[PDB]
Scaffold this active site. Structure first.
Site: not given
Ligand SMILES: [Fe+3]
Ligand SMILES: [Zn+2]
Lengths: 145, 613
Positions: B140, B142, B169, B172-173, B201-202, B253, B315, B342
């Protein structure tokens, strides 16, 4: 034996090291969990304590024997005042500004030697100045507080 | 040398080791707090999937638009045929902390070309290392553009002799999410035979509106955010779901499950699932529950140490899979091991289920400055994973003492925990009042821990946090007045003001409302009746606490149903939701108030043997 708050505090501090959540942790981390609760035994004490508690060499310890071990160990304790004299006897002329070279030399060879990482971190935090000398008084005061 | 020196040395050594162990315990506690705080928000966000899934059960079965942009604009030139020299220019433009805004035409061109090119790719991309004799896998990102630049500088630009596999991913973080996506798409376009992308997942329109990406896009391009967001959402549609390495190693992922079969994923119409958390847009063909569940399990699953396959309640989505199901899946699909990305790890990589599940994570300083170290995997022709580590922004990190380096992380964790705990202030105070039958102002430690666990439900080791959340407390009683004062501080309110929350569906995704109100259509004419409307609001409020209380929505329809129940009356019908959201926000607000430049050389690195880790 243990206090009503202690029997829960120890269990809460126990779960932070359990990989599987079964209440049993690897024996190699005993010197970390036992140290974190105010005790300061050496690795010789750790070996003596693990010999009396492990027989088949499984390397697993659960909560009750840890509780008994901590109850046995808690009977003796030391204050922070005795730390100062240990550094005082290492100053050959009372300057108070012991340099890093002999400080690294002594405890990496004498007593019970540490690994390279521990001393690296120690004389990385202590030797803030580039002169190569460490003031023990400020070190102890800032780390103890 | 004498015995006194030995005594002094061993005493100092004991003291130093004790303090090191204390610091290690503090680090572990802070990591636990961070992980639980992230999981608590992801779980709450994931209940929209359950709401849609059980609402389905109850109900019967090249145009030029971009305009000139206000503010400073960079005159960088990007042509349609992407070459190597464009990548260096793009990096140079994005390297600076200021003056890095490209012209909207080039962003639209890049997104459109990437969307057009990604359509031809199959669901699972086969990667062959026979010619290149080397392959690199990253985790990831991010929005950590500096981490991507560090990886590129250390390992070289992608090429036919050095391919890459980015494991989802992308965005968006972080605070620089758009740049990472644009750079990755440009690298894919310039090198189409050596860069492979995997959906994460993002990579969801629903998740982006909740973690600040849409806010960043709107702020950077106020005059063109709508079409840029539409192009980005189009790009998310066609990203491959996974990758197979040398026909022996699978790269996904999230993970897998007991019912997951690669012979089914390769036949899924990938274009339907523009979003994952909400149902796909079919052409009147009623949807299949299995395929959606397959994709959800692939994207959101997590591993567990214990045996069996149970649903991942930590989660709020996906399934936990143990060693037994992992071995069965590997034997069924004739694979060696599965690479995963993940979950973040303190060292950036870990092993699970007898070296058969490899977790990777390429985002450094994920939670706060100094939280964790990034990592990436280098695979040789024999697929032996060599692990590398790196931390970005070392120059600013080296200007602090060790105590300050721990204190910054501790303060960030405490601030985040108190911000999250701010929501339940009234119920928490009421619970504290109930446990004090004589209104003395002091309650027992056990009662304090029980109240905290019952209210917050975070599962944190509260007894270790007693001296920090409620400082200056004895060993038997804790006053709740000091605790309540902590969440009542003005700075905590200011910090919580910027934090987005669940709901706000119209601002987040109007497409979610459209999907709901197209799903509840018993007939295809587009007309609905109030009893179905009442059932829909009942089910919505059954899952989302304090949604509408079945009163504001019903009263809004009664104000509007002049000709009775019927069609979804376009925008003016959504004014009910608009005014309900405004009224709820005002009601809660009144109740509250009534009281440096990127530098790849600025890093430290380490290479770890596959068996030494
Ligand atoms: Fe992530
Ligand atoms: Zn993820």
């Amino acid at each position: 034996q243990l206090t009503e708050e202690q029997i829960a505090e120890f269990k809460e501090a126990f779960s932070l090291f359990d990989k599987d959540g079964d209440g049993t942790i690897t024996t190699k981390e005993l010197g970390t969990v036992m140290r974190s609760l105010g005790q300061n035994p050496t690795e010789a004490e750790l070996q003596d304590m693990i010999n009396e508690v492990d027989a088949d060499g499984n390397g697993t310890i659960d909560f009750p024997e840890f509780l008994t071990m901590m109850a046995r160990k808690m009977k003796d304790t030391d204050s922070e005042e005795e730390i100062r004299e240990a550094f005082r006897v290492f100053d050959k002329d009372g300057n108070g500004f012991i340099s890093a070279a002999e400080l690294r030399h002594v405890m990496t060879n004498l007593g019970e030697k540490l690994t390279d990482e521990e001393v690296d971190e120690m004389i990385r935090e202590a030797d803030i100045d580039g002169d190569g000398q460490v003031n023990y008084e400020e070190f102890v005061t800032m780390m103890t507080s | 040398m004498d015995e006194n020196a030995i005594r002094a040395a061993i005493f100092i050594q004991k003291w130093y080791r004790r303090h090191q162990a204390r610091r290690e315990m503090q680090r572990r506690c802070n990591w636990q707090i961070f992980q639980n705080l992230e999981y608590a928000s992801e779980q709450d966000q994931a209940e929209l999937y359950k709401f849609f899934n059980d609402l389905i059960k109850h109900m019967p079965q090249d145009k030029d638009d971009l305009v000139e942009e206000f503010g400073d604009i960079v005159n960088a030139k990007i042509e349609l045929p992407i070459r190597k020299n464009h990548i260096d220019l793009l990096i140079d433009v994005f390297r600076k902390k200021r003056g890095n805004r490209l012209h909207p035409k080039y962003v639209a061109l890049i997104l459109r070309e990437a969307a057009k090119s990604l359509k031809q790719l199959p669901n699972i991309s086969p990667v062959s290392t026979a010619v290149s004799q080397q392959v690199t896998v990253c985790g990831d990102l991010h929005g950590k553009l500096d981490d991507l630049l560090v990886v590129l500088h250390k390992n070289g630009l992608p090429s036919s002799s050095n391919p890459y596999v980015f494991n989802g991913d992308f965005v968006d973080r972080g605070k620089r999410g758009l740049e990472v996506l644009l750079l990755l798409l440009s690298l894919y376009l310039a090198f189409p035979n050596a860069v492979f992308l995997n959906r994460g997942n993002h990579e969801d329109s629903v998740m982006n509106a909740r973690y600040g990406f849409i806010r960043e896009v709107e702020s950077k391009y106020p005059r063109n955010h709508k079409r840029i967001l539409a192009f980005i959402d189009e790009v998310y549609r066609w990203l491959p779901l996974g990758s197979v390495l040398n026909s022996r190693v699978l790269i996904v992922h999230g993970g897998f499950s007991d019912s997951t079969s690669l012979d089914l994923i390769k036949s899924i119409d990938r274009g339907k699932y523009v979003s994952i958390l909400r149902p796909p847009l079919t052409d009147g063909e009623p949807l299949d529950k299995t395929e959606w569940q397959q994709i959800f399990d692939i994207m959101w699953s997590d591993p567990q140490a214990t045996m069996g396959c149970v649903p991942n309640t930590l989660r709020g989505a996906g399934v936990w899979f143990g060693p037994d199901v992992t071995d069965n899946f590997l034997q069924r699909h004739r694979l060696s091991y599965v690479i995963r990305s993940h979950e973040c790890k303190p060292n950036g990589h870990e092993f699970m289920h007898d070296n058969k599940i490899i977790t990777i994570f390429s985002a450094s300083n994920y939670y706060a400055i100094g939280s964790n170290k990034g990592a990436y995997i280098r695979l040789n022709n024999q697929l032996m994973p060599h692990f590398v580590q790196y931390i970005s922004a070392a120059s600013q990190t080296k200007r602090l003492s060790f105590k300050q380096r721990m204190g910054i992380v501790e303060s960030s964790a405490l601030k985040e925990l108190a911000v999250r705990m701010r929501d339940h202030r009234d119920e928490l105070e009421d619970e504290f009042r109930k446990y004090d039958p004589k209104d003395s102002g002091y309650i027992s430690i056990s009662h304090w821990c029980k109240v905290m666990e019952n209210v917050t439900k975070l599962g944190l080791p509260w007894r270790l946090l007693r001296d920090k959340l409620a400082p200056g407390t004895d060993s038997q009683k804790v006053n709740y007045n000091r605790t309540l004062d902590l969440l009542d501080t003005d700075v905590i309110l200011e910090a919580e003001a910027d934090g987005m929350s669940v709901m706000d569906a119209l601002y987040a995704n109007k497409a979610s409302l459209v999907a709901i109100f197209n799903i509840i259509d018993a007939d295809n004419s587009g007309e609905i009746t109030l009893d179905e409307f009442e059932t829909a609001i009942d089910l919505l409020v059954a899952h989302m606490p304090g949604a509408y209380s079945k009163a504001e929505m019903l009263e809004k329809c009664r104000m509007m149903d002049l000709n009775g129940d019927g069609k979804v009356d376009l925008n003016e019908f959504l004014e009910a939701f608009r005014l309900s959201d405004l009224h709820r926000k005002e009601q809660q607000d009144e109740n509250i108030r009534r009281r440096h430049d990127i530098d790849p050389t600025d890093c430290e690195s380490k290479v770890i043997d596959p068996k030494k880790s």
